[PDB]
Design a binder for this molecule. Structure first.
Ligand SMILES: Nc1ncnc2c1ncn2[C@@H]1O[C@H](COP(=O)(O)OP(=O)(O)OP(=O)(O)O)[C@@H](O)[C@H]1O
Ligand SMILES: Nc1ncnc2c1ncn2[C@@H]1O[C@H](COP(=O)(O)OP(=O)(O)OP(=O)(O)O)[C@@H](O)[C@H]1O
Ligand SMILES: [Ca+2]
Ligand SMILES: [Ca+2]
Ligand SMILES: [Ca+2]
Lengths: 350, 343
């Protein structure tokens, strides 16, 4: 998948303003991430789209149909989208299986086709052995995965996922996220993810909308957000940074306590502001010979948002490395791989 | 702080084993992190400590007093610890102010001392302007912080914190955890945190217990857990790693297709195994000319699991970086330009 457009949307609770003149589009098949500080309005936005909250002005359209505006306000039932709530509350008196079955057909999961879709959701999320559990019989991350499976089962053209993975250990989240998003993309599905995992957003988002106090500071690709953030607030939200008051010079540097540093800016010389350094930009020299120095050949370089993925031939194997930046090889190909420190060795009774 | 002793503790549900021969110890004022894959038994362990669940076997003692055993089983209200449940669960019919007041004195929050302590908790967690709200008027991360404020207000000698920060954006979680753990340490408090944030555990834990399928895989300092893991299983849970089939040599190197690499092991030469390299150990050379170079002097050097914390006098600042004798001269390089934001 669905297109979505939200135009000038605003929402207040009593004297409490929360969404302030928000505009946002989602293209068919697009994976959009919405991120921002606690309390900035993410869940309220999703609830306004799904019809659980009523905006007090603005417009919302979904796949070419107005669903909210000065003269329309469709019931939740008439809004063709899926919405995994941040609470992920399951029906207490239903089994995991029957929770997942709920949004398919008559809800009972008696048909072979339902059984097969439900089992596929259980396998994706790694909870097949818990199909007969009731929700009170589950850990926090097991309950989270069952809620995710139930949301995903009907495979809506648009799905809104409000922190679908926040209770899950890293390796688990990484597997589910990759398998799930590949499958959404394979099927042309549109999705909006709320996340506060910076690496997740940078890796998987087509575009990221960064919110602050009910407004959108910036909506951009991961590469543009990270390297060309609109604001210092956006820059600090998307990554760690070390900041100093600074005065811009005319030669592409700025002065700060640390020193005179090259800086990306087109503002006039004499502008005052703040300069930000990413911790990965620093190194200290000289350096000891590395534990191992190996000769390597660069096969392929692929820029990502905040790193470059390098394909390598070193010794007699090929590795892929993620590094803050690419090496300068007068050759374009000839490099030296360093290992810092001993590796670990495990005798592996496999 | 209060010391804690858990001894050969187990628990099954129905006929479903969930905690299996847990032993675990906490010295006064120690900060322990418990981590492990989803379903491994972290919350069940905490519930058994707090008396919400009853173990089948084993002993729990608190500051030297046996609280669970074959012959003893102190009710919840009698166990002198605080416990922040992974759901948080605020009292829905009380404001945030009265929720945080609840564990102080008569719960009314009418004494100047109570008002002061509630203000301290509202400020630590950044929710001062929400203190008049009810829980259903709050965002998920605000509800989480109010629940944390409520649990921390009585300042118990032992506090159990099951995922107290999981709904919070990075800057917020960093500030709250730095301020709060510094305060706990300054006051000598003992704390057990459950987390799945690896950096967090490695930075703040005095020890980390890694659980797997109901058992303790390894309990150790962050340095030991990360640099001497018990298990390729434990190694990969605590951090990333690139692996290679390798064969052990006798000079403390291992053969693998990448080369003859120095390795840490005591095993017998000839042992075939897996070599594991952490991503931080890799670099590719040569690097580009640096955008800038700043002369620096090393002030101090604090070893951590994945890096060393170095204090440096450079230009006209002191900078502290995660990246050598503590008085040496060195040069800081900056790779690429910094960003500049007009005021
Ligand atoms: N009534 C019950 N019957 C059977 N198993 C149960 C019951 N209650 C909990 N469990 C199981 O106990 C195991 C441990 O649960 P616990 O909540 O302690 O895990 P956790 O480590 O805190 O998980 P997470 O990281 O997902 O929060 C889980 O596998 C869960 O399925
Ligand atoms: N009934 C209400 N009355 C007044 N303010 C409310 C009410 N409900 C929510 N809010 C406020 O609206 C703002 C947006 O809340 P929302 O749940 O959308 O935030 P969020 O970005 O999802 O936050 P988090 O990251 O903490 O989950 C918050 O500051 C919250 O306190
Ligand atoms: Ca939210
Ligand atoms: Ca748990
Ligand atoms: Ca070989």
């Amino acid at each position: 998948t669905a297109a979505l457009h939200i135009g000038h949307l605003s929402k207040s609770f009593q004297n409490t303003p929360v969404l302030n003149d928000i505009s946002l589009s989602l293209d068919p098949g697009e994976i959009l991430f919405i991120i921002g500080a606690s309390g900035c309005g993410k869940t309220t936005l999703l609830r306004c789209l799904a019809g659980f909250e009523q905006p007090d002005s603005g417009e919302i359209s979904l796949s070419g149909k107005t669903i909210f505006s000065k003269n329309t306000n469709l019931p939740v039932r008439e809004r063709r989208l899926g919405y995994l709530v941040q609470e992920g509350v399951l029906f207490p008196h239903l089994t995991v299986y029957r929770n997942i079955a709920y949004g398919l057909g008559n809800g009972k999961g008696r048909t072979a086709q339902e059984r097969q879709r439900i089992e596929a959701m259980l396998e994706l999320t790694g909870i097949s052995e818990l199909a007969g559990r009731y929700p009170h019989e589950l850990s926090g991350g097991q309950q989270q995965r069952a809620a995710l499976a139930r949301a995903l089962a009907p495979d809506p053209e648009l799905i809104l996922l409000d922190e679908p993975f926040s209770a899950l250990d890293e390796q688990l989240r990484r597997q589910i996220r990759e398998d799930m998003i590949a499958a959404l993309r394979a099927n042309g599905k549109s999705a909006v993810f709320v996340s506060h995992d910076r690496e997740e957003a940078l890796q998987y988002a087509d575009r990221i909308a960064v919110m602050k106090q009910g407004r959108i500071l910036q909506t951009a690709s991961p590469h543009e957000l990270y390297r060309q953030p609109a604001d210092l607030d956006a820059a600090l939200f998307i990554g760690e940074g070390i900041v100093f008051p600074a005065a811009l010079n005319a030669d592409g540097t700025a002065d700060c306590r640390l020193g005179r540093l090259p800086v990306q800016s087109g503002a006039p010389a004499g502008t005052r502001g703040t300069l930000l350094i990413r911790p990965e930009q620093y190194s200290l020299h000289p350096h000891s010979a590395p534990a191992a120095s190996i000769h390597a050949v660069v096969l392929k370089t692929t820029p990502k948002a905040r790193h470059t993925e390098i394909s390598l031939r070193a010794g007699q194997t090929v590795l892929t490395l993620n590094l803050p930046s690419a090496p300068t090889l007068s050759d374009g190909i000839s490099a030296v791989l360093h290992l810092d420190g001993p590796a670990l060795f495990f005798p592996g009774n496999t």
